[PDB]
Every structure is written in structure tokens, then in C-alpha cells.
Symmetry: D3
Subunit: 289 residues, 6 copies
């Protein structure tokens, strides 16, 4: 029952964003509900097909922490924990890789591919597309080893951009070999920001389960729609557990040269379309300042 002139206004408003994005890379960190509820996940897959059919170049990075825990429990693999961290033994790494690449990534490739021959699954292992470096975590303020977990080290930017030039949507499971060929599991938020910077992405989108960034949670009036890196970096020691990784990734990407990073509400159906192609978006847009 929607009037024609309203349809026209919504469509026309996409023009400056289509201009900005045409022929550019967009890295999208996929996770949370958008990946659990069927309506949200089918809409997310459709939105990747949408970007491809505008001449835009999406790259999807996904996680799967809860799926990994679920499979480890099904296999009866007792975990060892340091602080809040499971130690990633070689056994845990094999399960993580098999879950992320062999199950979670598979769901997204198939959903996207209902729309066309677009998606292709990859890890850092394939064609040496990226490497990992082992990382410690701080437990009680002391650096602590927790096994085969790492950060992205180097990215085969040319090989990655060749795949995207071939018209493919890479669906990335974040595992990668270190310099000695030992595969590590990389946090998908930190990986998304590293890939965005390495590929020269125009935007980085990170789907979360909240409306946006509250600077003084739980004050409702502290929600912000736009913020620059300087202001944001001052509030990062203030933020709550959950938002800290998403914010750190937005900061590293935009300071690393990505023109804008977006923390968007993955509970909103077609949140990717709303963030990219409306003026208001549906979350918090981060830019340099």
C-alpha cells in the first residue's frame, strides 16, 4: 500500500552511496543473530547478492564461537581455561577449523548461492591467502599463552583481489598458517578489520546484536549515530565487555585507511542494505577525526 512517490524517494536516496561504493570492496563481519534466525540469514545472503549486482565487491568474514563450543561438547573434549579463555590445543584447533570451514562457512556459501554462482569459501590456508602470528592474551594483567590463536599477519592482497575481480564473494573462515605452516584460529572481528585494511576497502561493516554504540551504557541518551576515531578511542576504556572488540576493530580499520566503519544492528532485517543505501543507516558510523 506504499505510494509510488515514497518508493521513488527511498530509491533515489541510494544514489550518492552507489556512486561511492561502485567498484569498491566492502568487508562485512557476519555474526550473531543475523546468522541464527532464518529470516535474518536469508536476507543477509540476499544483500550480498544485491551488492554484487550493483558492481560492488563484498567480502564476508564470519565467526562461530558458540558452534565450536557446541561441537567440542558433543565430542567430549574436556577444555582447559585460563581466565575466560579456552586453550586452543592442536585438537581444539582441528575442531574449530572443521566447524568454521566445514559447517558455518558452508551454510553461508549455500545461502548466497541460491542467488547465483557467487560465493566461495576460503581460509588463510588456501593459496596462502593470509598468515597468522601467535598472540598472547592478558589474564589478570599478565600476558598469557592460550594455544593456537593468533592475529592476521600478512595478506595476499593481489590474490584476494583477483578472486573478487573474478566476480566471486569470498566467504572467509579465519584460520591461517603461521610462518612454519602451523594453523591458528583468529578472532573474526580482528580479522575483518585486518582484511579491510589490507584490501583497501571503502567500508567495514560489523553486525552486532544492539542498535548501535552507547557511549555511557545503560543511558539511552548516550546512543550515537556517528563518531570519529579520536572521540571513540577516548571512550574505549569506558565501554562494556561486548562492544570492546567491535570498537577496537572499527578503530584499527579507519585509522588504517578504511574511510568508514559501521557497527550495525544485525537484528534488523536487511541491515546491510539499510546501512549502505540510506542516509540515516541503522547503527554507528565511524570515520577519521
Amino acid at each position: 500500500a506504499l505510494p509510488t512517490h515514497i518508493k521513488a524517494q527511498v530509491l533515489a536516496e541510494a544514489l550518492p552511496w552507489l556512486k561511492q561504493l561502485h567498484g569498491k570492496v566492502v568487508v562485512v563481519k557476519y555474526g550473531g543473530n543475523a546468522m541464527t534466525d532464518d529470516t535474518l540469514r536469508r536476507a543477509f545472503a540476499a544483500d550480498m547478492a544485491f551488492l554484487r549486482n550493483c558492481g560492488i565487491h563484498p567480502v564476508v568474514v564470519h565467526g562461530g564461537g558458540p558452534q565450536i563450543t557446541a561441537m567440542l561438547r558433543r565430542l567430549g573434549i574436556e577444555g582447559d581455561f585460563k581466565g575466560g579463555f579456552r586453550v586452543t590445543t592442536p585438537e581444539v584447533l582441528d575442531v574449530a577449523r572443521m566447524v568454521l570451514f566445514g559447517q558455518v562457512g558452508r551454510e553461508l556459501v549455500n545461502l548466497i548461492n541460491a542467488h547465483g554462482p557467487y560465493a566461495v569459501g576460503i581460509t588463510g590456508e588456501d593459496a596462502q591467502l593470509f598468515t597468522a602470528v601467535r598472540r598472547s592474551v592478558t589474564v589478570d594483567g599478565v600476558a598469557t599463552d592460550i594455544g593456537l590463536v593468533g592475529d592476521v599477519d600478512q595478506v595476499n592482497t593481489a590474490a584476494m583481489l583477483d578472486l573478487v575481480a573474478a566476480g566471486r564473494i569470498p566467504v572467509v573462515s579465519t584460520l591461517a598458517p603461521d610462518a612454519d605452516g602451523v594453523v591458528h584460529n583468529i578472532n573474526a572481528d580482528t580479522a575483518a578489520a585486518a582484511v579491510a585494511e589490507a584490501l583497501g576497502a571503502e567500508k567495514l561493516l560489523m553486525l552486532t546484536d544492539i542498535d548501535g554504540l552507547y557511549t555511557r551504557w545503560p543511558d539511552r541518551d548516550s546512543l550515537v549515530s556517528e563518531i570519529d576515531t579520536g572521540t571513540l578511542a577516548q571512550l574505549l576504556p569506558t565501554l562494556e565487555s561486548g562492544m570492546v572488540p567491535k570498537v577496537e576493530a572499527c578503530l584499527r580499520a579507519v585509522i588504517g585507511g578504511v574511510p568508514s566503519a559501521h557497527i550495525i544492528d544485525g537484528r534488523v532485517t536487511h541491515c546491510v542494505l539499510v546501512e549502505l543505501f540510506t542516509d540515516a543507516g541503522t547503527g554507528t558510523k565511524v570515520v577519521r577525526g
Copy 2:
């Protein structure tokens, strides 16, 4: 004040049409009000930039009958008329070409180019892009010569598609040489359909000053949103003066292989966006049947 979920629905509905149009040619016959009121004309130019920034390949064909008459009166060139037709003397042809290519086309190239280096003006004279063949008209049921007017004869499909592959939007003024190099003026509606067929266009759009096709004017309930060629060809001897050329062009194009032709309401702001990227459109869609 428009809710996010409504913005999402309008945007998401474009997906099947972006899939269908990506990398395809769309010929758009530009005329009437869309070319006279400033808001409509700036929106039309913006919509050509829109298609280009989705990876779609627009080709604009324009007329300018009233501008030609206006200039002939300013020059004091007395016309000779047979039935309702001005005879196109060599003098009239020179004025028509100078108005269409040197004024009317120039307005559209500049408007479009406010958005980027897209538009390029051309006639059939440039690079022998298409030729004309002289045509008679029927006056009182007898074939009548009215000077240097013609139909499109042959199209340099390769050279045309090369220009479009270069990322340009051709803005076409319909003049063209015959086999002896004598330039003729071609009716812009018939030319648009000839170009659409020659280029293998996915759609032909024809902007008119009415909501759509009324099959039994003035009965309001005879308006139709979709119709096939068989049904439409049976009503063409019934239709009113104004709709006949637009309908004949839709019939020739779709029978000539163009999957769909559209008679759309040029009085609707961003009518091109509404016709292409909504399910309902804003006019009459013609397909084979």
C-alpha cells in the same frame, strides 16, 4: 519520518530487477515533461547516473519537435505542410539537426554530467553509428513524400556497444546519413525501438505524459499495467493519435527480441527508478505473448 523496516522493504524489492539488468543495455526514450520541468529533468539525469553506478548500461534517445518548431519560427522559415506534416527541406533539416544535437542533447549531457564523466552526445553521423532510409507518410491514405525524414536503416552495433563498454552513456540525437551521405531526421520513438533491438537491450523505456495505456480511452477502468504483444497489436487500430507511436515502438521492439518494453509516466519524479526497481512500476509493461 519513514521507518527503517519500510526503507528495507523498498530496497530489498529491487534485488530481482538488479539481477536481471546487471551488465545489460536499457534504451530510454526521453521526452515530454520529464524534459521540460526542472525537477523532473534533474531526476531523470540522476537516474541515468544511478543505472551506471549499478553496472547497468543506459542509452538515451531524445526528440525535440516543439524546440524545432520554436527555432524555425524565430528564424522566419516558412513551412510547407502536407496533411499534418512539415516538409523537411534541406534548410529545415539543418535547423532540426542544430536544435536537436546542438541544444536539446547538450542540456541532457550536461545534466547527466553533473554526476560524473558519463554522457556523450552522438548522432548517426558520428563514426557512421547508424544510417537512415527515406520514408513516406500516408496522407489521406496515399503515400506522401515530406522531405528528409527517415527510419533507422542499419546500426553499427559493435561501435555502439564499444562506447557503452567504455562506461559512457550515449545521448542520441536522431539524425543519420542515408547511403549517399544525405542526413535525415528520424522520429525519436521509432529510432529508440530500432536501437533497442539492434543493441540487444534488456528493456526499452518510453516516457509519456500519461499514467499508462488505456485500452478504451477515456474509460478509467481500461488502464492496464501489463499486456502482451498479441493483445496489444489487436488494439492498436483502436488507440488514440498520441499513444499510437509509443505503442508501435513497444510492439516492434518486443517482437524484435527485447524482453520487455515500458510506457511509463514521465510526470512521476524518478519514474525510471520506479519502473525498473519496483514490482508494480508506474505505467504499462509490454512482453511477448
Copy 3:
């Protein structure tokens, strides 16, 4: 302690085979011991790097039946069996895909990649590279359904050959969607022959755990080094359980246009090099006749 002139003779003997294979596809069915003992598996990976560094285009197809059974037992998933066949429920399919693509294929990609950025893992799901069609099996001479198992239906030959032209070695896990997007598990021997035919491969190699084809097992003197399709098809109803699938795949590939198919001894270190680059080989070579 090997004399120079002997080294020269072995190397020189490779010339006619390098001529025949340069720029050609070779599909290699990887399985059995060559995939279990560490020395054999590292040699197999090195041989894929060898072919790549001669300008040859290897494509590896692998199975993993025993790994799938092992994982199903670890998960406590009770199987239902018809004749000798496990029914592939949707649950069993998910485990099979996660084992084949997320563990077995991963081992080979990494081993190969110790030599360079060559290997890339793929299934039929990625970029719609190939499709599956559901297959029944004969149990007591009646066609029997055993769940989500299939044959290769169609192959995206162009997209596959593009990946190989990019200098990559595809490591193929044989899962693929049917026409409705439902993923099936395909027997890796039948898949290797289908891929070989579809890609226009020069040779198909199938690694087994025996010296070659005995036409009258267990008679030692019935081993053959070369045989044509006509003679071989007459003995297929005679052969033993294990050799039947390998022989059927060789027959379908060579009749399907692949110049030669090879059943080679995967227990021989560097068996791929020996089969391709010596006159005698190390198994049974099948050609049309």
C-alpha cells in the same frame, strides 16, 4: 652412489611424457595409504608441486570414508544400514561434509602449500562448480534409496578451468548441491572420472593399495600393465569388490574421451612421478580399444 649416466637416462626418459602433458589437465584420485602414511602423503604433495612446476595442471579429488565413519562414532550418531550402505541422513551429510572439506581436504591443502601458494579447497557448492543428482544403489538386485548420495550431474567447466589457469591446484571434496540446492555426498572415484571427462583431462590417475589390475585374482600371472576398454569391460563382471569402482571410473573416463586412465600403486613413494614420467609406470594403464 648412483652413476651420472644413469641419472641422465632416467631424466631423459621423461621427455615424451612432459611433451604430452605440458599445459594439460591431470585429475588425480587421492586415497588409501598415500593419504595415511606420512612419507607417502608428503611425497604425493611434492608431486603435485612437481606437476605445477612443469606447466602441468593437476586437479586432486579425494575421499575419506574411514574418517567419516570415525567421526560419526565419536559423535554417537547411530547409523542405519541397507545392505552394505549407510543411509546418508541430513545429519550424516553434515558430518561427511565437515570431515571431508574441513579436515581431510585441509590436510592436503596444507601439505601441498608447503611448496608454494598452489592448493585451494573446493566443493561443488563453491561458485556452483558442479551439481549432484540423487542416486539409488542396488541391494539384493532392487534399486534402493540410501539418502543424500549422488553422482556428479553438471560441471562448471569454464569456472574450473579458470581456477586452474590462475595457477591453482584445486583440491576437491566431493559434495555438491542438487538442482534444489540440497547438498549430496558423491563417491570420490565416480566424481574423479566425471571431472576428468568434463575438464578434457589428458590423464586420470587413481591411487589404489595394490600393484595394479589382476584380471584373474589371485593368479599372480594375471597382472597386466596395459589394457584397452573393450578387453577391460568384458572382465568387469569378473573382478573383485575392491577393484570394481576403480575400473568403472577408468572405463567411463576413457570412453568419455580422456586419452588414458591409470590405476597405480599408492604404496609406492612418488607413484605419481613414476606413472607419468617413466615408460613402465607402476600399475595399469587403460586406453581406448
Copy 4:
């Protein structure tokens, strides 16, 4: 009745100039008689086809001052004059553009195209090929505004050279938008020199209605066949009204890097061929010194 050995000598003498010009751009300023008498104009068009069929890349820049005045008088548009200059109102600009691009350029495109699909008409408006900057003129030694007239500001060298690489002969009407999109009329002599410098032309040719450059008009013995920029710049304050713009353009182009500039006698049939492919030429050749 011309002896064979004389034909051979004339042809052979072209060799060093064909070597120098092969694959190079030549900008030709077309105007005066060469554009008014039918024999001269058909010969000029034939010479553009000649250069194209030697692998040379001509670019034609034309004026049309007298045609513009003629049309303004036919329309009854009263002019306002400052010194010797007509003020270019928005009305005058529209007429100038419609005359230059819609009539004058059209004649040349058609003449050239009698020889092949070579010529294409363009202004700075098309594909943003070049921009204009507003210019004052000195009237009684004080800077004076005379409306929408300008100099070439920037040139889309890549897009221009792409058109020429496509085998086309651009026929340029010198109108162009300023940074705000407002179209200006540019003096065709100054534009030709700007285009020559921007495209890296090997030569700039300027057709005039005199044998060449007389350094002390009217002394017959002051005619010169070659002169360098240093000597020429010293005589520019000495020269007569008519030669000053042609000389200033030759100076700016050759100092701007064009190896040679030529003021040639447009009254000589095939003057372009004579200047380029004989040692003596038919005018004055300017080089750096």
C-alpha cells in the same frame, strides 16, 4: 603527363616524415577558406583520412566566428560590444554552441566520413573531456569581462587518447564547462594549442589565409619558412592583428613541449599533405630555440 621518376621522388621524400609521425598525435586547427571553398574543404577532409590510413592520429579543432555572427543576426539578437568584443551572454553562448557543434562541426564530420567511419564530434561537455576557465580581455589596457568566454583549463588526456586509440578522429567544437558546470566558448586557436600540449602531440598545424609568417609586413622579403621560439617571441609585439593569435598559439605549444608548430597556407589545396610530407612545406615551421 607526369614522369614516373618524378612521382617516385615526391613519394620517397615523405619517408622521414612518415617515420616521425607514425603512431603520433597531430592537432590541426581548421578554419578560414579551407573551410569555405568546397574544393579546399573536401581536400582537407581527405587529408584527415590520409593521416588515419598511415597510422597517424589527427585531432581537428575548429572555429566558426563568422557563422556565429550570421546566426545571431538571423535571430535578431542585439549584441553588446566592449572594444572589439561581443559580450557572450547566456543567450549568445547557446547560439554559439548550437552553431559550432550543431552545424559547423557537423559539416566536417560528414565530409571526413565520406571516407570511412572516422570522425566523431565532441566538446568539452562530453565525458568531461576538458574544462574551461573564465578569461578577461584587455580593452584600452584594462582587464574587461566579456561574458562566458574562457581558456582551456584541464584536459581529460586519458579519455581523449582512448578515443584516438579507438581509431576515431575527434572533431572538436571548443565549448566546455567551468568548475561549476557553466559552459563557456573558447577561442579555437588557443584551444588547439592547449589540446596539442595536453595530448603530447608531435605537431600542431594552424591553417591561415596567407603564405606564411612575414616578420616585417608588408615587406615581401620578410617571409620566413622556419623560425625558433626565441626569435619569434621577440617579434610578436611587432606582428599584425591577424597573425598574433596564430603566433601565440604556436609559441605556447612548442614551449609547452610540442616538437613543432606550423602556420600553413589554407588556400593551398591539400596543404596538410604538403606541410607534413614534403621537406619544404607550405608556410612557417616553428621549433624550440
Copy 5:
């Protein structure tokens, strides 16, 4: 002392021939005086540079009968003769190849290369560019073997056209292997016609030591400037010893699809330029009829 307007007429007359030849192959049989007198040979080399610098694609085929005889006498190699034919022993073949490719061809490559990096020497041996088939000759009306002499059998048209596309002028010495790799000497006139047909040449030029074709030698009034294949084939049994091979080659080439073949006066300086770029030429032009 030649007037400008005469220079213009000679140059302008080349236009239809430059149009016809642009981007086309011209095979030129080089021999006789044009290869002995220094002025003629330097002019011939300059004319090959001329064609290259018009975008034309010359291919030079040369002989060297007298040079071969001279070298055989210097080596004291006694000849055996059947009728008028020297038997080409393996020894004679080695001398012929070393003279033609190692001396005669070398002179032309160097002369041409004074003008640029154009010429490249080749025989049928190089890259298997063409093969030979052994030929008998008729001695007293009986077929007679005279050793390792042959006709062109097959031509590597693609490899030849690749060399010419690279901007090179092949200078061809007519030796070539038979199917068993045994090199034969091929008559350069017959080879030129075979190469012209194989490459799809626009013209074949054959330099001789006479004004043109006299149909009734020695009657001065029997000289002809143009003749078709039908008329010419009727006079071939009439012609004199010397003209027969040149005429047979023109007939085979034009009947084989080459639009025109030319027997031209190699004693005329720059005869190639005169034949190609004047209406009258300097010899006899053969076309189909």
C-alpha cells in the same frame, strides 16, 4: 624546382591505395637488379620501411640463383645437370642455404634495418614456419628428379602473422624441411605466390628486369598495363622463358584469392612506391576475370 601543387597532386593520389592497404599484408618478391645496383637496393629497403610506417605489413621473399652458382664455383663443387637444371645434392643444398640465408638475406636485413628495428630473417626451418614437398621437373617432356628442390607444402599462417603483428618485416630465404625434416630449396617465385595466398595478402609484387608484360614479344605495342587471369592464362603457353615463372606465380596467387598481383620494373628506382601509390603503376597488374 617542383611546384607545390604538383607535390600535392602526387601525394593526394596515394589516398585510395593507402586505404586499400592499411593493415594488410603485401608479399614482395625481391630479385634481379633491384638487388644488385646499390641505388636500387637502398631504395627498395627504404620502401619496406615506408610500408611499415604507413601501417602496412610487407613480407619479402628473395632468391639468389647467381650468388649460389658463384659460391659453388669458388668451392670447386662440380655440378651435374639434367636439361638446364643443376641437381641439388645434399652438398649443393648446404651451399644454397648458407648463401641464401647467410649472405643474401643478411644484406637485405641490414639495409632495411638502417631505418629501424624491422627486418628479421627466416626460412621454413625456423619455428616450422613452412614445409616443402619434393618436386620433379619436366626434361624433354618426361618428369625428372633433380635433387632436394621442392614447392611450399604448408604454411604456419598463424605464426607468420604473429611475427608481422609484432611489427617485423620477415625477410624470407626459401628453404624448408619436408615431412621427414630434410631441407629443400624452393624456387623463390613459386614460394612468394604460396606465401601470399597463405597469408591472405592484399597484393603480391614481383620485381623483374623489364617494363612489364609483353603479350607478343618483341612487339612493342603488345605491352599491357592490366590483364585478368582468364586472358593471361591463355597467353602463358605463348610467353618467353623468362616471364613464364613470374606469370605462373601471378596466376596462382590471384586465382588463390590474392586481389591483385603485379609484375613491376625493378630497374625503376622506388618501383614499389610507384606501383602501390600511383594510379598508373610501373608494370602489369593482374586481377581475377
Copy 6:
């Protein structure tokens, strides 16, 4: 009678060298016995086909001193000698060029081409592929002129690499023009090293008639399998007449950037294969140090 596992070991040992050489240039100086005994020469030709069919890019440089002397004696051309050097008169140069390019090079092109359309003969004259500069020699410690002999001056690296990219094996006869077009004969050892450096070759191979480099001839225990440039340059004033040119060429090439140079035993059948694809080789390998 060679066991399979031995064949496998020899083949597998080639892998690191195929990796190092894939897509790289190898310059091979061909001379001595490898060019005189039929078995050695056919094996050398087969080895050039081998490298080509691994994706390696061989370039063959040959000499022919003894063949030149033999031909000069057959022609009765009295030589003039300064020290041990024949003065290369213009006559001697013509014979040298005709022998090297017209006989010696021809043998190798044909032998190689028994394997495919690979070999192409060239000198510095063809396409100006390289130039020569005149060189004096030291006779009794005073610089002495000995006619038209020279060193390589400059190399058309792009044109050379284009030929090799086309899949051809250049067979180079070392003659080349100086800056004035006068052709000189260049020592083939010095030329091979100059070409290797200019083309960025991975290896330079020089075939000699000895096992390798003896540092204290005739002490059998002074033979060395590997040596660096620093150690080698200290022994060059110690070495014997024959080895000095081969050693000087290895030194200039490796210091000039070629990773390794090899003096190998041309009396060993398939010595090229043994040197490149075994760890031990068959001679002396020189590297920087």
C-alpha cells in the same frame, strides 16, 4: 633393469630445481663435442625441448671457430695473423657470418625442431636485437687491432624476451652491427655471458670438453664442484689457456647478477639435464661470494 624406487628418487630430486627454474631464462653456451658427435648433439637438442616442456626458457648461444677456418681454407682465402689471431677482414666477416648463421645455427635449429616448432635463428642484425662494439686484443702486452671483432654492446632485452615469451628458443649466432651498421663477429663465450646478464637469466651454462674446473692443473685433486666468484677471480691468472674464457664469462655473468654459472662436461650425454636437475651436477657451479 632399473628398480622403480630408484627411478622415483632421481625424478623426485629434480623438484627444487624445477621450482627454481620455472618461468626463468637459462642461457646455454653450446660448443665443442656436444656439437660434433651425433649422439651428444641429438641429446642436447632434446634437452632444449625438455626445458621448454617444463615451462623453462632456454636461449642457446653457439660458436663455430673450426667450421669458419675450414670454410676459409676451402675458399682459398689467405689469412693474416697477429699473435694467435686471424684478422677479420670484411671478407673474413662475410664467411664467418655465412658459416655461423647459414650452416652451424641451421643444424641446431633443425635438430631442436624435430621436437616441435621451437627454435628460431637470430643474430644481432635481426630486429636490432643486439649491437657490437669493436675490441682490441693484447698481443705481446700491447693492444692490437684484428679487424671486425667485438663485444656485445647493448641488448634489445624487451624484443629478446618477447620472442622467448612467444614460446620460441632463440638460437643465437653471434654477429651484430656496430653503431654505424658494420657487422662484427663476437666471441661466443663472452656473448653468452652478456646475453645472460641482459636477460636476467637464472643460470648460465657453458659446455666444455673437461669434467670441470681444475684449480691447479694437472693435479687431479684440484677439481672443484662449487666455487664462489671471489675465490675464482684469484685463480684466473693461474688457469690454463683453454679455461680462461669460460671462467671470465662465468665471473662476469654472476657478478653481473646471474645467480649461478656452470662449466659442465659436454662429453656427458644429456649434460644439461644432469647439471640442472640433479643435486651433484656434472661440472663446476659458480655463485657469488
